[PDB]
Amino acid sequence: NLKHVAGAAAAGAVVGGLGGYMLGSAMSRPMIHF
Amino acid sequence: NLKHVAGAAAAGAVVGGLGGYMLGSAMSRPMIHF
Amino acid sequence: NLKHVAGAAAAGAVVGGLGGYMLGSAMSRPMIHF
Amino acid sequence: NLKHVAGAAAAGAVVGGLGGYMLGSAMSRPMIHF
Amino acid sequence: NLKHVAGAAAAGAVVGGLGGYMLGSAMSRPMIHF
Amino acid sequence: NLKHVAGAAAAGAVVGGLGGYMLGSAMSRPMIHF
Amino acid sequence: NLKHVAGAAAAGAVVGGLGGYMLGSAMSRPMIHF
Amino acid sequence: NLKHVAGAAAAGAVVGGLGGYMLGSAMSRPMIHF
Amino acid sequence: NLKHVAGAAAAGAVVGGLGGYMLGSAMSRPMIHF
Amino acid sequence: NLKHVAGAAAAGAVVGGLGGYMLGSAMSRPMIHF
Amino acid sequence: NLKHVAGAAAAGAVVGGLGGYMLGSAMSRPMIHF
Amino acid sequence: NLKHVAGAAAAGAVVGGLGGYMLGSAMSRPMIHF
Amino acid sequence: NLKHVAGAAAAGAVVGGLGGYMLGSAMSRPMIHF
Amino acid sequence: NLKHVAGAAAAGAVVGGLGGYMLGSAMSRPMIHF
Amino acid sequence: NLKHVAGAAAAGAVVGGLGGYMLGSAMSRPMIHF
Amino acid sequence: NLKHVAGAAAAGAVVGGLGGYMLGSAMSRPMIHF
Amino acid sequence: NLKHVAGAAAAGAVVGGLGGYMLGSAMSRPMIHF
Amino acid sequence: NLKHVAGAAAAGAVVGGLGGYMLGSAMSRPMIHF
Amino acid sequence: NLKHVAGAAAAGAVVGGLGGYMLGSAMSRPMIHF
Amino acid sequence: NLKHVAGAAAAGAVVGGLGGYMLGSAMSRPMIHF
């Protein structure tokens, strides 16, 4: 068998966000000018 | 068998974010000018 | 004056979590045995 | 004056969580045994 | 004046988490035995 | 058998972010001029 | 004036986490035995 | 058998980010001019 | 004036974590025995 | 059998980032001119 | 074993107040003008 | 073993106050003008 | 073993206050003008 | 005329005790032996 | 006229005790032996 | 006229105690032997 | 073994305050103008 | 006129105690032997 | 073994304050103008 | 007129104690033998 604990389980303060799951891609081109 | 604990489990303060999971790719070309 | 862009603004995929803000402290003593 | 953009504004996919704000503390002692 | 860009702005894939902000302290003594 | 503890488990303050997982690639060409 | 770009801005893959900010201290004494 | 502890487990302050995992490649050509 | 680029900006793969900022101290005495 | 402790486990302050894992390659040609 | 006496036990006149216990924080900005 | 006496025990006149315990932080910016 | 007496125990007149314990930090910027 | 503010007025956290007022005296001879 | 502010007024954290007022005297002879 | 601010007013953390006021005297002869 | 007496124990008049304990840091920038 | 600021006003961390005021005297003869 | 007496123990008049303990740091930039 | 700032005002960390005020005298003859 196999046994686990993953993530931030039993953490004292989970204040930051958690990672998501992307099964795919992302096309990105920010456009910043000033 | 196999047994584990992973991540930030039982951490005193999980303030930073957690890594996500990308199964794919990302095309990127930032465009910055001033 | 002063002008900025901070964080993961305009990111192509913000999949990981973001850092929080603690103004204080955290007392911690994990107790693990097997 | 001062002008800003913060956070994950204009992000292509905000999938991970965002950091919170604690003005205080957290006492923690996980208790794990097996 | 002063002008900036900080963080992982315009990144192609922000998959890892971001650093938080602690204004304080953390007392820690992990207890591990097996 | 095999037994482990990985990551920042039982850390006193996980303030920095955690590494994600990319199973793929990233094409990148920043464009900066001023 | 002064002008900057800091952090992992415009990075092709920010997979590792980012450094946080502690304004304080951390007391630590891991206790490991087997 | 085999037994381990890896990463920054039981660290007093994990403020820096953690290394991710890329199973692939990255094509990169920064373009900077001023 | 003064102008800069710092950090791992425009890097092809920021897989390792980034250094944090401690304005303070850390008391440490690991206790390992087997 | 075999038994280990690796990484920055039980460190007093893990402020710097941690090395990632690339199973692949990186093509790079920075382009800087001023 | 361990044995103690703490506080102002057996004092001849406990006229001043005693210190409390805050497990948290306090945000403060007095506003005084005349 | 270990044995102690702490504080102002057996004092002839505890007229001043006693130190408290903050496990956290305090943000402060007095604002005084006249 | 170890044996102690600490603080202002058995003092003839504890008129001044006693030091507290902060496990954390304090951000401060007094603002005084006239 | 005369105008004042005294004590810990407008304090962000009055956790320690306050000094009392003795108009008199205190005779004291602690007797400790072990 | 005359105008004042005294004590720990507007302090961010008054954790230590405050001085009292004795108008008199204190006779003291601690007796410690072991 | 005359105008003042005294003590630890507007301090960021008054953790130590404050001086009292004795209008009188103190006779003292500690007796320590072991 | 080890044996001690610390602090202002058995003092004839503890009129001044006592040092506290900060396990952390303090950011400070007084702002005074007239 | 005359205008002042005295003491540890606006200090970033008043951790040590403050001087008291004795208007009188103190007779002292410690007696230590071992 | 080892045996001690430290601090201002058995002092005839502890009127000045006592040194505290900072395990950390302090950032400071007073701003005074007139 | 006359204008001043005295003491450790606006100090970044007042950790040591402050001088008191004795208007009188002190008779002293420590007696130490071993």
Side-chain angles (χ1 to χ4, degrees), chain L:
Chain L
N1 54 44
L2 299 81
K3 98 202 201 180
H4 300 291
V5 47
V14 183
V15 166
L18 271 38
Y21 293 75
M22 183 176 282
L23 201 173
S25 178
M27 183 176 282
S28 166
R29 36 174 131 184
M31 175 40 250
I32 294 88
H33 174 304
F34 33 85

Side-chain angles (χ1 to χ4, degrees), chain F residues 13 15-22 26-28 30 32 34, chain G residues 3 5 9-13 15-22:
Chain F
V15 166
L18 271 38
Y21 293 75
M22 183 176 282
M27 183 176 282
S28 166
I32 294 88
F34 33 85
Chain G
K3 98 202 201 180
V5 47
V15 166
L18 271 38
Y21 293 75
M22 183 176 282

Side-chain angles (χ1 to χ4, degrees), chain M, chain Q:
Chain M
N1 54 44
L2 298 81
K3 98 202 201 180
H4 300 291
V5 47
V14 183
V15 166
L18 271 38
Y21 293 75
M22 183 176 282
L23 201 173
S25 178
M27 183 176 282
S28 166
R29 36 174 131 184
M31 175 40 250
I32 294 88
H33 174 304
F34 33 85
Chain Q
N1 54 44
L2 298 81
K3 98 202 201 180
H4 300 291
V5 47
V14 183
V15 166
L18 271 38
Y21 293 75
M22 183 176 282
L23 201 173
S25 178
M27 183 176 282
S28 166
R29 36 174 131 184
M31 175 39 250
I32 294 88
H33 174 304
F34 33 85

Side-chain angles (χ1 to χ4, degrees), chain A residues 1-25:
Chain A
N1 54 44
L2 299 81
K3 98 202 201 180
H4 300 291
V5 47
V14 183
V15 166
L18 271 38
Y21 293 75
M22 183 176 282
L23 201 173
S25 294

Side-chain angles (χ1 to χ4, degrees), chain I residues 13 15-22 26 28 30 32 34, chain J residues 3 10-13 15-22 34:
Chain I
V15 166
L18 271 38
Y21 293 75
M22 183 176 282
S28 166
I32 294 88
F34 33 85
Chain J
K3 98 202 201 180
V15 166
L18 271 38
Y21 293 75
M22 183 176 282
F34 33 85

Side-chain angles (χ1 to χ4, degrees), chain F residues 2 5 7 11-16 18-20 22-24 26-27 31-33:
Chain F
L2 298 81
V5 47
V14 183
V15 166
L18 271 38
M22 183 176 282
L23 201 173
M27 183 176 282
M31 175 40 250
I32 294 88
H33 174 304

